[PDB]
């Protein structure tokens, strides 16, 4: 709810490392879908260097994702709302562009609701481990019955 | 037996024939299935379902639209519907909805 885009750029270099999901076989989800429309934490190099492909924080749109795909680029660090330095809200750069419009997210859009709504709506199609109750256990932080120890 | 009964009918076994658009008069590519289906009219009839209200009566205890003349109280606007407005930037639509 009350979570809303407030600042413009919190101005943090911080972000999370995005790789393709590679679940046990081949590419259950590519890199291009994972990183699309997000903003770079730092400039990315080619396999060789003294080459700035994407310069620091830049929205990765379709051309940028394909220029990264032209090259062999295997890994990308991305600003996320979890890392945003803005307090009491999200800096527009840390979130992403996504909307019904492709442009970067506007200042003041209430993203928490559209985030929650987007997660909840498809939930009809999940199963009855696995399924929809499994999702809830994740979001409820619930400790499994016989956990491991680290 | 169905196909056999269609033979006595003089009608094709496919149960499909060629049909022609009454507009352009030209044929329809592929055969289409034509036949006779028993069909029911349920009573969900649209001039039962249809309701509209501009300014009607109001509940006394809470001043809220309430139908008393059968010019029905307005459609009930919910929490989920509020979120839909909250996801959108519509502040003024939302204020006017629950105030004026």
């Amino acid at each position: 709810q009350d979570l809303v885009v407030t600042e413009d750029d919190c101005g943090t270099h911080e972000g999370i490392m995005m790789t393709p999901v590679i679940e046990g076989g081949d590419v259950k989800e590519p890199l291009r879908d994972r990183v699309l429309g997000r903003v770079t934490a730092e400039d990315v190099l080619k396999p060789g260097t003294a080459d700035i492909l994407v310069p620091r924080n830049t929205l990765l749109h379709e051309q940028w994702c394909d220029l990264l795909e032209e090259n062999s680029v295997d890994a990308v660090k991305v600003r996320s709302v979890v890392s945003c330095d803005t307090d009491f809200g999200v800096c527009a750069h840390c979130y992403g562009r996504d909307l019904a419009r492709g442009h970067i997210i506007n200042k003041g859009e209430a993203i928490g609701v559209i985030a929650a709504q987007s997660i909840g709506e498809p939930g009809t199609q999940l199963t009855m481990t696995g399924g929809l109750p499994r999702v809830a256990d994740l979001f409820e932080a619930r400790r499994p019955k016989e956990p491991a120890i680290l | 037996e169905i196909k056999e009964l269609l033979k006595l009918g003089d009608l094709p076994t496919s149960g499909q024939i060629r049909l022609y658009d009454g507009r352009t008069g030209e044929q329809f590519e592929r055969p289409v299935t034509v036949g006779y289906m028993y069909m029911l009219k349920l009573n969900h009839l649209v001039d039962d379902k249809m309701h509209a209200r501009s300014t009607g009566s109001y509940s006394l205890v809470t001043q809220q639209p309430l139908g008393g003349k059968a010019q029905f109280g307005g459609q009930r606007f919910g929490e989920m519907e509020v979120w839909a407005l909250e996801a959108y930037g519509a502040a003024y639509t939302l204020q006017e909805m629950l105030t004026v």
Binding site: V4, G108, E109, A110 | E86, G89, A91, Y92, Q95
Partner: peptide, 19 residues
């Protein structure tokens, strides 16, 4: 205090703790 209203609240929130 979001969307169209975010301009408003912002303009009001700042009026506070002032004079």
């Amino acid at each position: 205090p979001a969307g169209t209203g975010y301009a408003y609240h912002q303009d009001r929130m700042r009026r506070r703790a002032a004079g």
